[PDB]
Amino acid sequence: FVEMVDNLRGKSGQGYYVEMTVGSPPQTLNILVDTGSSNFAVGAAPHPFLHRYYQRQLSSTYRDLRKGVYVPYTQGKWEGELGTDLVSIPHGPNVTVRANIAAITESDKFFINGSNWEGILGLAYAEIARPDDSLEPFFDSLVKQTHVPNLFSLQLCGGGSMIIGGIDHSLYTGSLWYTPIRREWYYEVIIVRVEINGQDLKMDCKEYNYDKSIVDSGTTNLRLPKKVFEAAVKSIKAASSTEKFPDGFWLGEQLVCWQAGTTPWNIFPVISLYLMGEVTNQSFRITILPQQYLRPVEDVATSQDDCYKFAISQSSTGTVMGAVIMEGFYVVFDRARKRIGFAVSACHVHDEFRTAAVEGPFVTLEDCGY
Numbered sequence: 307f308v309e310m311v312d313n314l315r316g317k318s319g320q321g322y323y324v325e326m327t328v329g330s331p332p333q334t335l336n337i338l339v340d341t342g343s344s345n346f347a348v349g350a351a352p353h354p355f356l357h358r359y360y361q362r363q364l365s366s367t368y369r370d371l372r373k374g375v376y377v378p379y380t381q382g383k384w385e386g387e388l389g390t391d392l393v394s395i396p397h398g399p400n401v402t403v404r405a406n407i408a409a410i411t412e413s414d415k416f417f418i419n420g421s422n423w424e425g426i427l428g429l430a431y432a433e434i435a436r437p438d439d440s441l442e443p444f445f446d447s448l449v450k451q452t453h454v455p456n457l458f459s460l461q462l463c464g465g466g467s468m469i470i471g472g473i474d475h476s477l478y479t480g481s482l483w484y485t486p487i488r489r490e491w492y493y494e495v496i497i498v499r500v501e502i503n504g505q506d507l508k509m510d511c512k513e514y515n516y517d518k519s520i521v522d523s524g525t526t527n528l529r530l531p532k533k534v535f536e537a538a539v540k541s542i543k544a545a546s547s548t549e550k551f552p553d554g555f556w557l558g559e560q561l562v563c564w565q566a567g568t569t570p571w572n573i574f575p576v577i578s579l580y581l582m583g584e585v586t587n588q589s590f591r592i593t594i595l596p597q598q599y600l601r602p603v604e605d606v607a608t609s610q611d612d613c614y615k616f617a618i619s620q621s622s623t624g625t626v627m628g629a630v631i632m633e634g635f636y637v638v639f640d641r642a643r644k645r646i647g648f649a650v651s652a653c654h655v656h657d658e659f660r661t662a663a664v665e666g667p668f669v670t671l672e673d674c675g676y
């Protein structure tokens with residue numbers, strides 16, 4: 307799938323986007339690749355953070371659905387009007403589909419300054435689509451209207467690639483390990499074990515999935531439930547005891563800086579998340595390096611140093627395997643087989659001592675879900 311390789315641009319902090327065309331004549335927009343939502347929602351009115359927007363009046367294929375949509379959430383707000391129009395992905399499948407579009411007229415803390423994207427491609431299931439499950443998501447429309455296989459894959463690089471309808475073997479090394487999609491709403495998965503520098507957190511596996519565990523490209527951080535987060539911070543603090551950082555750094559509210567090229571990657575531990583396998587009590591592990599959980603914050607003002615933000619944060623809505631976890635892994639969203647595949651990416655993170663990995667099988671001779 308050579309033409310789809312390198313079709314994504316961006317970073318973990320501001321999100322990965324794909325170029326898409328909306329309407330007829332086609333209007334070009336950069337769209338956020340989001341596996342944690344289900345609406346194809348685009349800016350359709352001027353905004354201080356929007357460089358361009360969807361102009362419905364200039365589209366002869368636009369159809370108004372005469373239904374408003376108001377989405378109030380924790381991190382922000384957005385409202386608009388529902389409609390349908392012709393949609394295509396220039397560096398994706400060579401197809402044109404009619405898909406639902408949420409025309410964003412008003413928003414609060416939704417769009418990001420200098421993100422370079424004007425909309426969101428909600429790749430999750432209809433159950434979480436707004437205003438309700440009757441609003442068919444883009445991928446469902448794509449699969450229904452074309453002969454594109456019910457599968458997509460993400461290769462997020464610290465740029466990247468979105469392969470629609472298949473797996474590109476040039477984007478990964480070794481074997482692909484599959485975890486079952488527990489329920490088709492968010493991309494829900496099951497964590498069976500968490501290790502910090504090979505040391506088990508020793509918690510009932512349900513704790514890692516309170517109240518759910520999801521794979522989300524639309525979230526930066528690895529988000530963990532309160533109890534899991536505290537024990538993880540304690541284990542990372544103990545492993546990196548040679549240096550003491552402010553409480554603010556551990557809360558994700560302040561930066562940690564070291565002289566350019568002197569980051570002590572070796573003092574920080576590796577994090578292993580054991581995901582539920584396709585067979586009973588069997589599992590595989592994904593290993594995360596500090597290079598993934600210590601997200602660099604690019605700022606010309608602080609450029610004499612390399613400054614980092616701790617990319618592990620507290621969650622009250624379950625575990626979120628964000629962009630920092632997805633980076634350096636080729637993630638296969640096998641919708642047709644209700645499973646998520648993980649393999650070491652060609653753009654994986656590694657130093658001379660350690661490498662990010664996808665390894666198994668592991669046997670644990672209870673149900674880890676909620």
Ligand SMILES: COCC#Cc1cccc([C@@]2(c3ccc(OC(F)F)cc3)N=C(N)N3CC(F)(F)CN=C32)c1
Nearest residue numbers: 318319320321342343345347377381416436524525526
């Ligand atoms: C990776 O970071 C870049 C980004 C982003 C971003 C911007 C706006 C909204 C979202 C959204 C989001 C997208 C669409 C939404 O509404 C839908 F109805 F359109 C709501 C939130 N995408 C995800 N995955 N989440 C996680 C959250 F819930 F914690 C907070 N917000 C979101 C992501």
